[PDB]
Design a binder for these strands. Structure first.
Ligand SMILES: [Mg+2]
Ligand SMILES: [Mg+2]
Ligand SMILES: [Mg+2]
Ligand SMILES: [Mg+2]
Ligand SMILES: [Mg+2]
Ligand SMILES: [Mg+2]
Ligand SMILES: [Mg+2]
Ligand SMILES: [Mg+2]
Ligand SMILES: [Mg+2]
Ligand SMILES: [Mg+2]
Ligand SMILES: [Mg+2]
Ligand SMILES: [Mg+2]
Ligand SMILES: [Mg+2]
Ligand SMILES: [Mg+2]
Ligand SMILES: [Mg+2]
Ligand SMILES: [Mg+2]
Ligand SMILES: [Mg+2]
Ligand SMILES: [Mg+2]
Ligand SMILES: [Mg+2]
Ligand SMILES: [Mg+2]
Ligand SMILES: [Mg+2]
Ligand SMILES: [Mg+2]
Ligand SMILES: [Mg+2]
Ligand SMILES: [Mg+2]
Ligand SMILES: [Mg+2]
Lengths: 100, 83, 152, 99, 127, 208
RNA sequence: ACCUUACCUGGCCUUGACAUGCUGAGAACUUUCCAGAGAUGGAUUGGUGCCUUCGGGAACUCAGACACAGGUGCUGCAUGGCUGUCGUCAGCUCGUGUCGUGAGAUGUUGGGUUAAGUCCCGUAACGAGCGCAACCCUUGUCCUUAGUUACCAGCACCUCGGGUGGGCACUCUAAGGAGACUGCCGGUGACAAACCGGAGGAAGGUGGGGAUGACGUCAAGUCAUCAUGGCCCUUACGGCCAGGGCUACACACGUGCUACAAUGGUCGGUACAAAGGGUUGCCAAGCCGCGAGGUGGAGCUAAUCCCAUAAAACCGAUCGUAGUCCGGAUCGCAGUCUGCAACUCGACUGCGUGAAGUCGGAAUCGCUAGUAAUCGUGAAUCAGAAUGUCACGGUGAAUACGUU
């Protein structure tokens, strides 16, 4: 949970949202059924021209409070051992201990 | 293996260097880090020094090693043997 | 257990012979919850029994069961230096359970084509005292009567 | 004709809202097709409680979503909208259809 | 006329209707043999009929849903017994001694945390 | 042995959630993050005002914040030059516009969080924990407070070893789910390390 | 796989990727360029913006100077918080009184009884507290409320589908209640607490299961989730980037999965679940491929549409005890999908090959009823990646004389 880790994940999220659409039509051109080979090649080279650290696959979502890479839950935004703290105090609406 | 939708995968800078190296024939190795790049059929007969993790190993390319990747000719672990 | 609180259950539903003992025998031959497979095996064995000859297959079944239940059982007990083996009479309920367990276990290891054939062979052979189960019963009986000194 | 869908995280206040909507509808002279309790949605979580290695020591949590359906027949006065601040007060999600 | 019973067994339920008839029997609008194929399910679904010796007189209409085949058969038996009780409500004893009126409460025990199954544990090597 | 959080296990029985709103998968995480951040910010700024409970309600696209404090005059002073500034600030943080009202808590010494505040502050002021904990128990039990328990753990005084000392009075049934136990935890950051303070307060039973 | 990432090799920054304080110079942005592995640097068509007390200012961007920032660096034997363990074991104490010179004792000992320091009866002790039990969730029966997207008993039509008109009967869903209390009877018992049986009931003796963890123990675990006392680095123990590593392999151990087959393997015909997830999503019908899959775009912010065909079981045919129509490892060739990118190092598909394995030494583990055994389904994490984890149903046993 170094501050550098959080800073650079924020940078990654900003830069992936920066383009966020050129990638879309470039993928559409590459995967198009009938698009000719030359368009395929131009799309490939254009998409590879983009910065490497600009794809959604490099985003590793962390705890928005501590930046813990592991034990993340997407229903909340919290990690494993901040969710329990929030839920015990009754902050989280709807969350209760259950047995069934 | 990569799908057949896009035949090869080659890096732009490595491809540019390879295509430059044909105006004057094979004389010097091309220094690179791109182990992910597949060898093309038209760069045969030229020597490429690929990164290893500590240095660059020189590989002389012949016709039989076309469909492979550069990183396949640079072992990243030593293991001289337990005994 | 220590509390002596175990209560016995009542599930006993012979479908088409209406014989109380065959349901428990099928429970003994059952493996891994597959009631139907054991059902089929036992019925096939009884069909083989009824077609080898004129004997009622069910009657041959309880005749074999009677001719295989042991009368006395040997119980081990360490007396402080050696483990002796006293005899004791077998409870009426334990006799039939021991008989079925032995019969099934020895039919498991015969070596004919299908398990139903193994079971049929065991019932035919033990119905007069010639199977492996009957000689195990004789071994238990002689072992028990060779320790009659303790008995009490 | 108008239909109302009600969603909440607990049963007391959703019951209160259903009761008040129904009684207002009865007072205003309209007809109501009875409230329908749709099956609740139960989503469960199992979370480790130690900061470090204790795998068998877990703790389990749950969220329940309760859903009710109302619908009215023969409407002439439309003040169910007029209670936009009151039909839903704190934590009730209300969906209106056939407005 | 008619009588209605609701049977329940192992997450399965059955609605049974008894009318005057000649033992037609129909489950989910198909015959008993087509539903329970060569097992004791026929025996268990018929048991109260012969114990009360009214197998031939009642026409039965059944709709069953949920569970497995044995659970469905148990549901049919339970519903049949309840409807038979409400028809001629004097033989409650006769079924009671047979244990048909009682509803079996056994259910699938839930999985527990740290265990493999509801009761099985990992192997426990001590060294 | 490790206990369970008394506030956590009594949710839906005697206790109520601080935040009361409905959200769906679109924006549940956003609302939860906003609630946590605004609670941290509000508790951080106005520590001087004795604030314990901060409830958040979210009707359609709007927020209402109710603050429980023992100093209404401090938060709302001379017509409230601070409440309006706080309103604009909290509207800057939260997406939705914010409505604020201040609800004072009568009997401040009966609130577990306020008692923890006071004990931690005294331990900051180098007061002997003996006297602090005794006086807290006495002031609580003198009026109401049908039971109370206080626990202080750490390097008490300046000893080069950490221990736990706890004082109890009345009856505090922790295994009873009908007991409206009010619980609080707080940290005192001293010159040698952290000292933890835990407070349980038992008001009484509830029926119906 | 890259990222995670904390490690290695090399390239590169020094108020710095991030905070506040000072100063000067300008908006932010958008420009599809070149060099480089990239970090980065040099070029770069466009409007130089908003509010104006027109003195200027805000946000944002860039450069300098210091106080600084920064550290997944050390100490868990300086700590907070959180957790395991004994142990869901039935115990652990206090106030007043009394006994002893004192440490201490009494209460809390004794006869019964209980799952229980549970209760009764006696008693220099009289009371209280934390534990036990009850309150809580779920499952098992019944009633009221309500009948849509759920249901179809009765009626009408029906292309024979709850498909339609319609119905409030039923199943079901979900809120409120009833019910189970040793309540009634016989016997024993100090005619007490209680115990053994019986009737009624869906359920009988804390009905089944779960949550609930007393005072303390182990200087138990965590400084790497977070927080933090002291110590340590500040041209590096801080920060940025590209390749590699965490996947190595003469060996040893722990936990699983698949088998060694005939209660079985293949082919054909057929029946019955629960639970859950889907708008940066699920992803149909039709069509194209042996296949993984590709095109397509309907429906659904969901009791409505999708994921989505449950499997074992049953019926028919074949195999006939063979290292085999068993077993599937390994390897060769050819592909699909995700992803900037499947060499190191992904998951699947087709064709071929077809290993060890014939029920396992000393030793050792789980399980008492819907349990063990066995069969399948779903979700979290997640671009892709589960034989693990957590849940869900189907079929369905053996045994307990007893405390040596
Ligand atoms: Mg930090
Ligand atoms: Mg990832
Ligand atoms: Mg269950
Ligand atoms: Mg071992
Ligand atoms: Mg420490
Ligand atoms: Mg420790
Ligand atoms: Mg500590
Ligand atoms: Mg004690
Ligand atoms: Mg005392
Ligand atoms: Mg005393
Ligand atoms: Mg004295
Ligand atoms: Mg004592
Ligand atoms: Mg006693
Ligand atoms: Mg007690
Ligand atoms: Mg009875
Ligand atoms: Mg009884
Ligand atoms: Mg309890
Ligand atoms: Mg616990
Ligand atoms: Mg230690
Ligand atoms: Mg250690
Ligand atoms: Mg790297
Ligand atoms: Mg590893
Ligand atoms: Mg095969
Ligand atoms: Mg047990
Ligand atoms: Mg199961």
């Amino acid at each position: 949970a170094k501050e550098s880790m959080k800073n650079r994940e924020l940078k990654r999220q900003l830069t992936v949202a920066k383009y966020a659409k050129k990638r879309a039509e470039l993928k559409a051109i590459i995967a198009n059924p009938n698009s000719s080979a030359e368009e395929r090649w131009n799309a490939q080279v254009a998409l590879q021209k983009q910065p490497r650290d600009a794809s959604a696959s490099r985003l590793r979502n962390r705890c928005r409070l501590t930046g813990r890479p592991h034990g993340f839950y997407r229903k909340f935004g919290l990690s494993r051992n901040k969710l329990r703290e929030a839920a015990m105090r009754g902050d989280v609406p709807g969350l209760v201990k259950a047995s069934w | 293996p990569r799908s057949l939708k896009k035949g090869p995968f080659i890096d732009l800078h490595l491809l540019k260097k390879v295509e430059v190296a044909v105006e004057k024939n094979d004389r010097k190795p091309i220094k690179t880090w791109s182990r992910r790049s597949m060898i093309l059929p038209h760069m045969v007969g030229l020597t490429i020094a690929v990164h290893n993790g500590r240095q660059h190993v020189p590989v002389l390319v012949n016709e039989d090693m076309v469909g492979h990747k550069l990183g396949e000719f640079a072992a990243t672990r030593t293991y001289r043997g337990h005994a | 257990p220590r509390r002596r609180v175990a209560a016995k259950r009542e599930v006993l539903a012979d479908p088409k012979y209406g014989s109380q003992i065959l349901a428990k025998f099928m429970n003994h031959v059952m493996e891994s919850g597959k009631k139907a497979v054991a059902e089929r095996i036992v019925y096939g064995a009884l069909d083989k029994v009824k077609e080898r000859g004129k004997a009622d297959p069910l009657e041959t079944f309880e005749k074999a069961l009677d001719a295989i239940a042991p009368l006395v059982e040997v119980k081990s007990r360490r007396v402080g230096g050696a483990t002796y083996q006293v005899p004791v009479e077998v409870r009426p309920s334990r006799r039939n359970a021991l008989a079925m367990r032995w019969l099934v276990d020895f039919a498991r290891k015969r070596g004919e084509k299908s398990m139903a054939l193994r079971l049929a062979g065991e019932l035919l052979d033990a119905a007069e005292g010639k199977g492996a189960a009957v000689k195990k019963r004789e071994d238990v009986h002689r072992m028990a009567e060779a320790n009659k000194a303790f008995s009490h | 004709q108008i239909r109302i869908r009600l969603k909440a995280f607990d049963h007391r206040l959703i019951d209160q809202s259903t009761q008040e909507i129904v009684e207002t509808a009865k007072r205003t002279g309209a007809q109501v097709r009875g409230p329908i309790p749709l099956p609740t949605r139960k989503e469960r979580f199992t979370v480790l409680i130690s900061p470090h290695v204790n795998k068998d020591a877990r703790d389990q949590y749950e969220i329940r979503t309760h859903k009710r359906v109302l619908d009215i027949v023969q409407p002439t006065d439309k003040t169910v909208d007029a209670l936009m601040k009151l039909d839903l007060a704190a934590g009730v999600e209300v969906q209106i259809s056939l407005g | 006329t008619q009588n209605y019973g609701t049977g329940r067994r192992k997450t399965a339920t059955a609605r049974v209707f008894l009318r005057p008839g000649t033992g037609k029997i129909s489950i989910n609008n198909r015959g008993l043999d087509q539903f329970f194929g060569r097992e004791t399910a026929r025996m268990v679904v018929r048991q109260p009929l012969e114990l009360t010796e009214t197998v031939e007189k009642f026409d039965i209409f059944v709709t069953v849903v949920g569970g497995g085949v044995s659970g469905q058969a148990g549901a049919i038996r339970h519903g049949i017994t309840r409807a038979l009780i409400e028809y001629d409500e004097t033989l409650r004893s006769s079924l009671r001694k047979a244990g048909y009126v009682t509803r079996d409460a056994r259910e699938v025990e839930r999985k527990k945390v740290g265990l493999r199954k509801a009761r099985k544990r990992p192997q426990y090597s001590k060294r | 042995g490790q206990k369970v959080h008394p506030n956590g296990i009594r949710l839906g029985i005697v206790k109520e959630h601080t935040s009361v709103w409905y959200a769906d998968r679109k924006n549940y995480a956003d609302y939860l993050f906003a609630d946590l951040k605004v609670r941290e910010y509000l508790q951080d700024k106005l520590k001087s005002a004795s604030v314990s409970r901060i409830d958040i309600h979210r009707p359609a696209q709007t927020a209402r914040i109710t603050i429980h404090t023992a100093r209404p005059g401090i938060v709302i002073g001379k017509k409230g030059e601070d409440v309006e500034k706080l309103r604009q600030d909290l509207t800057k943080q939260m997406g939705v516009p914010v409505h604020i009202n201040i609800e004072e808590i009568r009997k401040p010494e009966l609130d577990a969080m306020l008692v923890a505040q006071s004990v931690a502050q005294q331990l900051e002021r180098r007061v002997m924990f003996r006297r602090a904990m005794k006086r807290a128990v006495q002031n609580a039990m003198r009026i109401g407070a049908k039971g109370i328990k206080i626990q202080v753990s750490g390097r008490l005084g300046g000893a080069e070893i950490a221990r736990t000392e706890w004082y109890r009075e009345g009856r505090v049934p922790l295994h009873t789910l009908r007991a409206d136990i009010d619980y609080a935890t707080y940290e005192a950051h001293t010159t040698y390390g952290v000292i933890g303070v835990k407070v349980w307060i038992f008001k009484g039973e509830v029926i119906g």
